[PDB]
Amino acid sequence: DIQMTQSPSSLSASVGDRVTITCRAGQNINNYLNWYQQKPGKAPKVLIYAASNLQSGVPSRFSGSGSGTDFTLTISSLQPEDFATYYCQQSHSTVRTFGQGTKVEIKRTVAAPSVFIFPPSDEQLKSGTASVVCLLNNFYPREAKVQWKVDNALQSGNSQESVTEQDSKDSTYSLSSTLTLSKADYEKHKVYACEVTHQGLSSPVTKSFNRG
Amino acid sequence: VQLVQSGAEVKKPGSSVKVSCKASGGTFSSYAISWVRQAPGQGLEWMGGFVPISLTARYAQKFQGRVTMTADESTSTAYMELSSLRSEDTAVYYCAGALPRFCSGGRCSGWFDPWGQGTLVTVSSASTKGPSVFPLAPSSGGTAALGCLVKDYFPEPVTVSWNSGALTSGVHTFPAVLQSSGLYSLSSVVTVPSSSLGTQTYICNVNHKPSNTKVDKRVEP
C-alpha cells in the first residue's frame, strides 16, 4: 500500500493569505493524485484531479502541482467558505490510499459574544431532571470561559459544553454550556447565573434569572 | 447524477450490516461505485472497488474476509455488506462513483466524483432510545434567542429543522455531547428579532430516525 504522508495536519490563516498543503508518496504515482475537500457534515467533493487539473465549478484560487511523489495543493487567497478538511489520494495502484487530511481554519478580528441564559422548561422538570443552558452566540476567537453559579456557589463537574464548527461566512464560533442538576437540587436554590469571559469583552458579563 | 444511500442503523457486535447506494440521475453503472469509510473525526479509508475488465471485486486488506460488494445493474444500486462487526467499525460509510478515466490495460486511474450522503453505522449493545424535546424560551439591541433541547437519546444521528425548513438564517444546532448516562443530548438555537415574538410562531422539528421519532415542540414565551 502506497504511503501518502500529508502535511500539515492542521493550519490557520487570515482571509486573503496564501496556504499550501503537501502530499508526498511512497513510490512514483505518476500524475494520478487527487484532492478532495470535505466541509463539516457533508461528503467530500472532488476539487482537483490528476495532480494539476481543476474540476470546473471550483474557484480559480485553488491549484494543483506535482509529478512523481511530491505534490502540493495551493489555494491562492483563502476565503471563509474554505473552512474544511482537505485530503489527497493516489489513483495509481489498485488499492487507493488517502492522506491524513488537513483541517483549515480562518483567523479573523475579535468579535464579542452575545450571551443568553435559559431556565429548564416546565415539562422537563416533571421528569426528575432539570438542565440550564447558556448560549454564547457568534464570537471569535474560540477561547472562552463560562462559569455557573447557583446562589453564588460556583459549580464544577455538572456542566458540559458544545461548540459549533467555524461559520462558513463570518468565521465565528458559538457555544452552549448545559448545566444539569437534580430537580431537588434545583428547587432548593433561587438564583442561577452564567458568567462568561472573553477577549471581546472589557470585563465579564453575567446573565442570570431567579426561579420565579 | 446522484447517489442516495440507506439510513443510519445500529448493529450489535458480531452481526453484519448491508448498506445500499442508488444511482438516480444520468446513466450510471452500479459496478462503478466504490466504498470509503470515515471513522468519527478520523479521515478516510478505502474499502473496495470493482476492477473494470473482470468486474471482480478488490478489497482493502483490512476488510478482506469481512466485506462483500455487489451491484445490480437494472436496479442501478450498489451494496456493501460488512460482517463480524466490532466497535472500531463504528463509522460513516460513503459510496463514491469511480468513473473510468486515464485507463490502461483494463485498469483506470480516475477519481471519485459523486459521493453519497453517507450512512452512519453505530455498533453497540445499548438499546435505541428516543429523544425528549424541551423548549428553550426567550426572555441586547432588539435580537432575542430561542431554542429546543433534544435530550436522552441513542444512537447519535438526530436532525433538527425550524418552522419545517422555513427558518434557515441564524440557526445553530450544536454537536451532540454524550452525557454520563451514556445517552446523547444537544441543543438547537436560533436568534430572532424581538418584534416577532407572538407575531410569529417558531416550531422546531426533531427527527431521530433510528427510533422512528418525529416531534414538533412549540417554543414561545
Residue numbers in the entry:
A (entry chain L): 1 to 212
B (entry chain H): 2 to 52, 52A, 53 to 82, 82A, 82B, 82C, 83 to 100, 100A, ...
Sentences from the paper on this structure:
Several potent bNAbs bind a conserved HCV glycoprotein E2 epitope using an unusual heavy chain complementarity determining region 3 (HCDR3) containing an intra-loop disulfide bond. Here we report the identification of new antibodies containing an HCDR3 disulfide bond motif using computational screening with the Rosetta software. The Ab HCDR3 loops interact with E2 mostly through backbone-backbone interactions of the β-hairpin at the tip of the loop.
However, there is also a possibility that these Abs were indeed elicited in response to HCV infection and contain additional mutations that facilitate correct placement of these HCDR3 loops and/or shape other regions for interaction with the antigen. Moreover, both HEPC3.1 and HEPC3.4 originated from the subject C110 sequence pool but were discovered using the bNAb HEPC3, isolated from the subject C117, as a search template, confirming that the P3SM approach can successfully identify Abs that evolved independently for binding the same epitope. Interestingly, in cases where both native and chimeric Abs showed binding (HEPC3.1/HEPC3.1HCDR3 and HEPC3.4/HEPC3.4HCDR3), the native Abs displayed stronger binding and broader reactivity to E2 proteins than the chimeric Abs. As expected, in contrast to HC33.1 bNAb that bound equally well to 1a157 E2 ectodomain and 1a157 E2ecto ΔFRLY, both HEPC3.1 and HEPC3.4 failed to bind to 1a157 E2ecto ΔFRLY, suggesting that the new Abs target the AR3 antigenic site similarly to HEPC3 bNAb. To explore structural features of the discovered Abs, crystal structures of the antigen-binding fragments (Fabs) of HEPC3.1 and HEPC3.4 were determined to resolutions of 2.8 and 3.3 Å, respectively. Contrary to our expectations, both structures revealed a bent HCDR3 conformation like the one previously found in the AR3C, AR3A, and HC11 bNAbs, rather than an extended (straight) loop as seen in the HEPC3 mAb that was used as a template for this P3SM search. An overlay of the HEPC3.1 and HEPC3.4 Fab HCDR3 loop tips with known Ab co-crystal structures does not reveal significant clashes. Despite previous experimental evidence supporting HCDR3 loop bent conformations as effective interaction geometries for certain HCV AR3-specific Abs (AR3C, AR3A, and HC11), the long length of the HEPC3.1 and HEPC3.4 HCDR3 loops (19 amino acids) coupled with obtaining only their apo state crystals remain the possibility that presence of the bent conformation may be a crystallographic artifact.
